[PDB]
Design an enzyme around this catalytic site. Structure first.
Site, PDB file in Angstrom:
ATOM      1  N   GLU A   1      -2.849 -10.135  -5.489  1.00 36.42           N
ATOM      2  CA  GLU A   1      -3.672  -8.969  -5.658  1.00 36.42           C
ATOM      3  C   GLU A   1      -4.273  -8.973  -7.076  1.00 36.42           C
ATOM      4  O   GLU A   1      -5.431  -8.711  -7.208  1.00 36.42           O
ATOM      5  CB  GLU A   1      -2.884  -7.649  -5.459  1.00 36.42           C
ATOM      6  CG  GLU A   1      -2.432  -7.260  -4.032  1.00 36.42           C
ATOM      7  CD  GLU A   1      -3.566  -7.055  -3.052  1.00 36.42           C
ATOM      8  OE1 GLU A   1      -4.749  -6.901  -3.536  1.00 36.42           O
ATOM      9  OE2 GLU A   1      -3.265  -7.057  -1.852  1.00 36.42           O
TER      10      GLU A   1
ATOM     11  N   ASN B   1     -14.358  -1.788  -4.032  1.00 34.15           N
ATOM     12  CA  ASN B   1     -14.487  -2.169  -2.637  1.00 34.15           C
ATOM     13  C   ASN B   1     -15.872  -1.788  -2.179  1.00 34.15           C
ATOM     14  O   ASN B   1     -16.559  -0.986  -2.808  1.00 34.15           O
ATOM     15  CB  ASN B   1     -13.411  -1.517  -1.742  1.00 34.15           C
ATOM     16  CG  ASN B   1     -11.984  -1.734  -2.247  1.00 34.15           C
ATOM     17  OD1 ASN B   1     -11.194  -0.767  -2.392  1.00 34.15           O
ATOM     18  ND2 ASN B   1     -11.650  -2.937  -2.541  1.00 34.15           N
TER      19      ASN B   1
ATOM     20  N   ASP C   1     -16.755  -0.042   0.274  1.00 38.14           N
ATOM     21  CA  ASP C   1     -16.854   1.356   0.687  1.00 38.14           C
ATOM     22  C   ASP C   1     -16.944   2.311  -0.509  1.00 38.14           C
ATOM     23  O   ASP C   1     -17.028   3.524  -0.300  1.00 38.14           O
ATOM     24  CB  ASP C   1     -15.715   1.781   1.588  1.00 38.14           C
ATOM     25  CG  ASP C   1     -14.375   1.841   0.877  1.00 38.14           C
ATOM     26  OD1 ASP C   1     -14.253   1.468  -0.295  1.00 38.14           O
ATOM     27  OD2 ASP C   1     -13.414   2.256   1.494  1.00 38.14           O
TER      28      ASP C   1
ATOM     29  N   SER D   1     -14.600   2.700  -2.819  1.00 45.50           N
ATOM     30  CA  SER D   1     -13.291   2.935  -3.376  1.00 45.50           C
ATOM     31  C   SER D   1     -13.019   1.804  -4.411  1.00 45.50           C
ATOM     32  O   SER D   1     -13.734   0.805  -4.447  1.00 45.50           O
ATOM     33  CB  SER D   1     -12.244   3.015  -2.297  1.00 45.50           C
ATOM     34  OG  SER D   1     -12.139   1.800  -1.623  1.00 45.50           O
TER      35      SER D   1
ATOM     36  N   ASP E   1      -9.630  -0.538  -6.191  1.00 50.77           N
ATOM     37  CA  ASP E   1      -8.248  -0.956  -6.253  1.00 50.77           C
ATOM     38  C   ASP E   1      -7.800  -1.165  -7.710  1.00 50.77           C
ATOM     39  O   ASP E   1      -8.513  -1.768  -8.527  1.00 50.77           O
ATOM     40  CB  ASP E   1      -8.069  -2.276  -5.499  1.00 50.77           C
ATOM     41  CG  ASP E   1      -8.679  -2.272  -4.144  1.00 50.77           C
ATOM     42  OD1 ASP E   1      -8.507  -1.343  -3.370  1.00 50.77           O
ATOM     43  OD2 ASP E   1      -9.427  -3.232  -3.866  1.00 50.77           O
TER      44      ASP E   1
ATOM     45  N   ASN F   1      -5.431   1.351  -3.734  1.00 48.81           N
ATOM     46  CA  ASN F   1      -6.776   1.795  -3.430  1.00 48.81           C
ATOM     47  C   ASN F   1      -6.968   3.312  -3.600  1.00 48.81           C
ATOM     48  O   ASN F   1      -6.111   4.087  -3.242  1.00 48.81           O
ATOM     49  CB  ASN F   1      -7.095   1.355  -1.994  1.00 48.81           C
ATOM     50  CG  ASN F   1      -8.547   1.548  -1.598  1.00 48.81           C
ATOM     51  OD1 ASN F   1      -8.948   1.164  -0.464  1.00 48.81           O
ATOM     52  ND2 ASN F   1      -9.348   2.042  -2.497  1.00 48.81           N
TER      53      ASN F   1
END
Length: 129
Positions: A35, A46, A48, A50, A52, A59
């Protein structure tokens, strides 16, 4: 902070993640490796909208508040910035809630795709724990 592999394994054990919800420490170290590359300050936007955050790339759609993810929840009741600290307490506390949510560690896309099923014990191999 960029943790070393064994250094993170130790921290994660100290904060109660070793075998949390049945996931051995190697699973957590492997998820962190893929990650964030063990870098607590990792961020990734991201598609969308959002973002992380942190060693476990948690997220903002569900888990933390960054003030710029319309429609989101903040189920860990924290600012996403708390997930970037050198001290991993907030990331661990939040991960414990995520891993308890019903899907286990499948919540971490990198875990599912790169860790799940593999020799995850390699990740703590050699570490004083």
């Amino acid at each position: 902070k960029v943790f070393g592999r064994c250094e993170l394994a130790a921290a994660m054990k100290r904060h109660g993640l070793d075998n949390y919800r049945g996931y051995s420490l190697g699973n957590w170290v492997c998820a962190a490796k893929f990650e964030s590359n063990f870098n607590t300050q990792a961020t990734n936007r991201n598609t969308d909208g959002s973002t992380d955050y942190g060693i476990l790339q948690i997220n903002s759609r569900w888990w933390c508040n960054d003030g710029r993810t319309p429609g989101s929840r903040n189920l860990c009741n924290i600012p996403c910035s708390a997930l970037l600290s050198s001290d991993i307490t907030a990331s661990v506390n939040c991960a414990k809630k995520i891993v308890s949510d019903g899907n286990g560690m499948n919540a971490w896309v990198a875990w599912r795709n790169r860790c799940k099923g593999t020799d995850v014990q390699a990740w703590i191999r050699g570490c004083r724990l």
